[PDB]
Design a protein around this ligand. Structure first.
Ligand SMILES: CCC[C@H](O)S(=O)(=O)O
Ligand SMILES: CCC[C@H](O)S(=O)(=O)O
Ligand code: SF4
Ligand code: SF4
Ligand code: SF4
Ligand code: SF4
Ligand code: SF4
Ligand code: SF4
Ligand code: SF4
Ligand code: SF4
Ligand code: SF4
Ligand code: SF4
Ligand SMILES: [Cl-]
Ligand SMILES: [Cl-]
Ligand SMILES: [Mg+2]
Ligand SMILES: [Mg+2]
Ligand SMILES: [Mg+2]
Ligand SMILES: [Mg+2]
Lengths: 623, 166, 166, 624
């Protein structure tokens, strides 16, 4: 076919068996790829027993996916989809690994990873060769050492193999750190030190299957495309337009650490107790002059080059390496902990990258703990040390308790939602009022109270990915912002930052690749909608330990109803009954009933009628 | 006469040079068929790698079936793909391990300087990186010393940036 | 509207920006009368320094004789040299210590953005350094944080490059 | 006055007094600036007693000079001129210090430094303020530490003073390192860590006066110019031409360490025993990938940016900083010592920069010692250790003996020529046959035997700057290569690397600045010729310890007559008879008599008839 190989790898780590499975054109026209394709596979294989599947057990599926735009659209993303250890629903995460490109160049569109290896393994894919290999020497390594050993050794192996064909480029590698190895709930899947499949806890899923890394190298062409000269014309168009985004190419998201708090008053400061600051220490000019050793860094075929590398050659944290750091790390590993200095923020960002922990949910649990310490709820005896705002060494000590699940680390390693329930139970006090999460996922570093940011009222409240600021809901529920357009980019799969040409132009590019005739209206009313409904269903079915009730859990954390205590919109916060009105309105526009459960009529019009079986179980454990 | 001068520390790894070259020469995106290939053995250390037009053309003189010749106008190697038996002799003769046989192609690929107007340099300049630049005079013998194993260049750069901590 | 984005690590120290600006505004070579000045406090650490057009214009509001105003089209500060009594109030009001009173001039100098077509950016681009680039679009408040002491930027960069050995 | 301020600072370190002296238009039309102006001042003040002037004694003058194009023409050079501890003549040396630019913005065109300070001082110039200041705390500092302390403190002082005028740019600084403080004969004057007034031994002159550094800051405009609109037009055109020199901007002289020996077979290898190599370790690609932390570094107003910064973060020499290194360091601190690895060359280049030693005459003395060791003339017991080719640690230990004048270091610190005579006398063996010098100055790293380089037959042999490869002679003696055009750039003062527009266009640019109407013909036949003749006269008068005889010393060192042992022109070398023929012909064209002494006639036409008094002292000593 066009744009796809029409093929997935199917890897049973339990039986140590690999096979190829066909991707029908029917499935691809219905679900496209990435997030959509993974949601289908998960519902198809697990939806009947969903509430019994432990995300950290042998029966979960880890899906590594691409989409038709995967090799051809500017920039580079690989999609990762699984049952989430955080929400017990599904998260379409992405990361800028060339893994998806190398898979496509090797003949595949993705990997279904089943079961659980008896000992640490890694998956090695080189053109037609696929092997499950012992990884016990690398279990315990962070990313830097993993590149210097495992990745280097595999590249030399491949170079010896192809001595007479020349020197192949390096293979792509996704991997976990010690956080995923020890099943910390908010562990990430990493690539190239600094890129993450961040939301969802998939580092813990990967770690729970004893999978250290996936390494892939392809040397053939990408699948052919339907209209090659329309592809070339649009590509030149897209490059010219993307080259013009001067400040985003020069600074990336690294201007956010100052600008989100100062300009939009929507940045978490000390576990969201404030959302405004005027602290110029954290301005990008200081990250650049004090830490940036590479100002322009790009993923495959990317004209934006939004990435940067920060590196510390001085001070006690000498050796720390991170990116700009990304704004979400500047906020959650910085201002959310009361820390405004680049040197300390690069240090803490380096630690979560090296440990393979999602910086958002990590900073959220750390700021949560620090607020409990400030309020006397967690004592110096509970922690083992003082946990003051601004003290980067106290926060690094806590990070290492979490990854080793030592002392209080064993509770915190379960994530903010579960920890706040456990501590509430233990202390006889409601500490869930300090947990800033939605559906068990830490709220991304864009608050709703100021209404000066893109996030407001129901953005997180009704979303099938909860606190995930990269896939928020909007009103109108269709229309070019909101879950449906975001589900597209996560199914393409393409990088968000490279969508300047616009949703329609990008669908048009996709049709020129694939030979499909998908329209924006069909995405918004059918393909996108059925992805969102299946994710809503799996999220409402919930996991074995935590279940959501839309009448309770389609809401903002209560801190978001307290008036902002500072800044140029001091006193502002949304009103709880206005949110409920908007939640009700979102339900109708998206096709959920009045309780927020997808309408069975809608499910049949969408072609996923057999999901009514799942809706009935929802309604039972509902009424 | 043109020669591509490479500044590895200006390379962002955008690999738009790879996309332009493979689209131009294969009509399809095909990283390992690009005649300029960027090596990123450690994140952030990006080493673009291509032919330097050795005045003694080790590749051309090692080819057993005479699939390789030298363009008279530009000094570039030209591949007759139908004569190539993918034996790897040019791969081994090259001081920089530059000739590349991509999977399923049936022929080596080597930079042909785009007939005298490198499209890789154009896109690299338009992106503002300028890791690739054209020099226009007569060939200088020091150009040939730029044909070096990409792994040696990467390790040199990594050590220069990260020091004893690498 | 335009704003000059500076990348100190791409600055070569050629100071062709200083030559171009001072020839343009003074008709003579005059380093300390240039409205962009490059600080090289340690060999090889070059920090170009100029106005950032603070939205609150501390200089303009501190001027006791109203010598300073804001151009309506560009947003640049404009100096009436005849009104200027060289008191240093704008010097002290400026978060980045940008205003400069050169010896014998009888007035401050402050960047006027060349009326909307910076000649410093043009020559830096022509030279291939691109340490100065133009951003077009609405003012972003973070731009104002680039007005800081050139000596702190220089010490920051030196420690980043040379580490504990500086 | 156009292009000039019309005045020099006159600094007497002995009496600790400072005054301004007037620079007449007539002197400037006669001698222009820089090397020429300095040669005049030296002849006028000292020429009648030249042969009694010890370059290392308090009667020597140290001249820091500009020319009319300094500050306007692209690039930046300051001129240094004195009596040379090496040749006992005069060297128009230059370095890319902004000192000349700051001086001109402060109202002066140069500095005459006389006498000798009782203890270490430095000279501080800030617009109107000129002060001699205690430098005792800084004595002994290398350039890195000097920039971090002295220069930083002085910048903060200027900032505090000019608090209500804004933040001044940094002052410019020239300085000496330990080699200069200890009067090592081939010590350089340094700026910005890795730029040098290299030839001449002027670091020893400055060290002999107890002058650690000169620091200058000006914030006024440069002098008015005659035709500012023409200046502006030519500048744009010059920039556009200079921008196009792609490989020189990207690599500087850094491709020389490989290309001079491999392509031209004219690079010194193991004290010139070979001149060809095939070694790719020293290629610029390996300096760039292993060591360069700044690829484009430029001096004031320079569109060329030929400079680079090399810095080692790894290995035993971690912390070493230098430039590409400059070709002459890659050869003389590298291949000349049998060292081809960039890491080791950056290390040795850093040491020589940090010590303030000229890399050329330093590598020359080091390779000379290593060849004496190889031949058994200098023993392990004479040195204190083995001195094998390729051993960068052996060479570094010897560098430190030299600077401290300890052991064999005390002899070696006198330079290759004087050391070869002392060793010859001590050992009863002629070791001058291994000394590659002309008129007491180490031959620059461009040999003559292959004739594939720009240097051939009489290039060093007849030059008034001896082995100085940057001011060689050529045939025709006038015309656009040779000593007269080099003396122009050393007097203009501008950087040689920025002369792509050509000698004629650069003169025309000079006239647009100054309102003069100098032509190329009068530079070649008068102004340049009178500069060269006064330099020839002063070199023939010679110092107190060493004198030259043109019948003997207008010649190449003997190694340059042995056939090349290796490379594509194995067997090649000039014949001493053809050199003699060319030397006598060079005399005719330049206006020297049969014995190479300037013609009294020519001196009169040139307008320097009084120098006949010096010519007669020369014939008296040479007994005609
Ligand atoms: C400044 C915008 C930041 C991006 O939205 S993010 O928070 O890095 O996802
Ligand atoms: C490659 C040419 C080098 C220059 O002539 S130099 O020897 O650095 O003076
Ligand atoms: S925009 Fe940034 S993240 Fe997205 S692909 Fe390009 S470089 Fe990678
Ligand atoms: S285009 Fe230039 S910058 Fe981008 S990868 Fe190719 S060489 Fe490096
Ligand atoms: S670089 Fe390799 S491929 Fe190019 S000419 Fe030299 S030998 Fe042939
Ligand atoms: S691989 Fe093809 S081109 Fe290279 S030598 Fe063998 S035949 Fe000739
Ligand atoms: S010059 Fe043309 S062929 Fe050679 S690499 Fe660049 S794009 Fe490919
Ligand atoms: S022109 Fe650009 S590179 Fe040269 S000094 Fe000015 S800013 Fe730095
Ligand atoms: S930077 Fe200084 S000078 Fe420019 S606007 Fe702000 S205050 Fe005025
Ligand atoms: S110095 Fe001139 S401009 Fe600045 S405040 Fe005083 S008077 Fe106004
Ligand atoms: S913009 Fe114009 S005025 Fe402002 S600095 Fe650049 S050249 Fe001088
Ligand atoms: S060419 Fe090199 S040395 Fe001459 S002035 Fe320019 S940068 Fe300095
Ligand atoms: Cl490292
Ligand atoms: Cl240092
Ligand atoms: Mg990151
Ligand atoms: Mg996302
Ligand atoms: Mg140097
Ligand atoms: Mg010279």
């Amino acid at each position: 076919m066009y744009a796809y190989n029409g093929k997935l790898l199917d890897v049973d780590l339990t039986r140590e068996k690999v096979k190829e499975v066909e991707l029908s054109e029917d499935v691809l026209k219905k679900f496209y790829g990435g997030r959509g394709l993974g949601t289908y596979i998960l519902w198809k294989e697990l939806g009947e027993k969903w509430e019994k599947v432990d995300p950290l057990g042998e029966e979960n599926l880890l899906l590594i996916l691409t989409g038709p735009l995967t090799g051809y659209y500017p920039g580079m993303k690989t999609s990762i989809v699984s049952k989430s250890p955080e929400s017990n629903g599904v998260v379409g995460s992405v990361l800028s690994s060339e893994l998806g490109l190398e898979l496509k160049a090797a003949g595949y569109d993705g990997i279904i990873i089943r079961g659980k290896a008896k000992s640490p393994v890694y998956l090695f894919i080189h053109n037609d060769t696929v092997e499950i290999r012992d990884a016990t020497k690398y279990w315990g390594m962070g990313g830097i050492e993993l590149y210097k050993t495992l990745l280097k050794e595999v590249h030399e192996e491949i170079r010896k193999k192809e001595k007479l064909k020349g020197v192949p480029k390096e293979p792509a590698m996704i991997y976990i750190g010690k956080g995923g190895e020890n099943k910390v709930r908010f562990a990430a899947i990493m690539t190239k030190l600094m890129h993450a499949a961040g939301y969802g806890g998939y580092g813990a899923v990967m770690g729970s299957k004893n999978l250290k890394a996936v390494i892939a190298k392809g040397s053939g062409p990408l699948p052919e495309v339907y209209d090659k000269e329309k592809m070339k014309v649009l590509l030149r168009e897209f490059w010219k337009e993307l080259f013009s985004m001067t400040t985003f190419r020069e600074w990336g998201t690294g201007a956010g650490g100052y600008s989100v708090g100062h300009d939009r008053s929507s940045e978490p400061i000390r576990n969201w107790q404030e959302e405004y600051h005027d602290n110029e220490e954290i301005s990008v000019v200081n990250f650049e002059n004090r830490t940036w050793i590479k100002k322009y860094w790009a993923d495959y075929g990317c004209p934006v080059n939004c990435m940067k590398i920060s590196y510390l050659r001085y001070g006690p944290y000498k050796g720390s390496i991170s990116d700009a750091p990304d704004y979400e790390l500047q906020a959650y590993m910085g201002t959310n902990l009361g820390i405004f200095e680049p040197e300390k923020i690069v240090y803490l960002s380096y630690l979560v990258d090296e440990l393979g922990l999602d910086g958002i949910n990590t900073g959220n649990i750390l700021g949560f703990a620090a607020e409990l310490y400030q309020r006397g709820i967690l004592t110096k005896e509970d922690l083992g040390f003082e946990l003051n705002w601004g003290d980067e060494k106290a926060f690094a000590k806590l990070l290492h308790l979490i990854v080793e699940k030592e002392g209080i680390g064993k509770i915190l390693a379960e994530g903010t939602y579960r920890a706040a329930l456990k501590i509430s139970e233990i202390k006889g006090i409601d500490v869930t009022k300090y947990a800033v999460h939605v559906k068990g996922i830490a709220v991304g570093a864009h608050g709703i109270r100021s209404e000066l940011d893109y996030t407001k009222d129901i953005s997180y409240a009704v979303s099938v990915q909860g606190g995930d600021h990269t896939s928020t809901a909007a009103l109108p529920a269709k229309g070019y912002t909101g879950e449906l357009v975001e589900a597209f980019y996560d199914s393409a799969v393409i990088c968000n930052f490279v969508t300047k040409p616009g949703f329609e132009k990008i669908i048009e590019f996709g049709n020129a690749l694939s030979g499909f005739n998908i329209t924006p209206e069909q995405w918004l009313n059918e393909i996108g909608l059925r992805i969102i409904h299946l994710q809503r269903i799996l999220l409402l079915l919930g996991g074995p330990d935590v279940y959501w009730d839309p009448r309770k859990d389609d809401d903002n954390p209560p801190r978001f109803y307290e008036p902002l205590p500072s800044g140029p919109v001091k006193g502002k916060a949304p009103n709880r009954e206005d949110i409920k009105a908007k939640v009700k309105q979102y339900y109708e526009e998206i096709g959920y009933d009045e309780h927020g459960i997808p309408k069975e009529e809608v499910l049949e019009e969408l072609g996923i009628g057999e999901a009514k079986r799942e809706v009935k179980r929802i309604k039972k454990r509902l009424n | 006469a043109i020669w591509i001068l490479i500044t590895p520390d200006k390379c962002s790894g955008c690999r738009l040079c790879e996309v332009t070259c493979s689209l131009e020469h294969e009509g399809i995106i095909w990283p390992e068929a690009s005649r300029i290939r960027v090596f990123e053995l450690f994140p952030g250390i990006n080493v673009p790698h291509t032919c330097v037009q050795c005045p003694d053309y080790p590749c051309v003189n090692a080819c057993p079936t005479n699939a390789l010749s030298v363009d008279e106008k530009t000094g570039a190697v030209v591949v007759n793909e139908e004569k190539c038996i993918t034996c790897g002799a040019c791969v081994l003769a090259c001081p920089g391990k530059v000739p590349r046989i991509p999977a399923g192609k049936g022929s080596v690929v080597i930079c042909d300087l785009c007939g005298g107007n490198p499209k890789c340099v154009e896109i690299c300049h338009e992106a503002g990186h300028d890791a690739l630049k054209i020099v226009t005079g007569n060939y200088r013998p020091i150009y040939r010393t730029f044909a070096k194993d990409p792994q040696e260049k990467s390790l040199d750069i990594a050590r220069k940036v990260f020091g004893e901590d690498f």
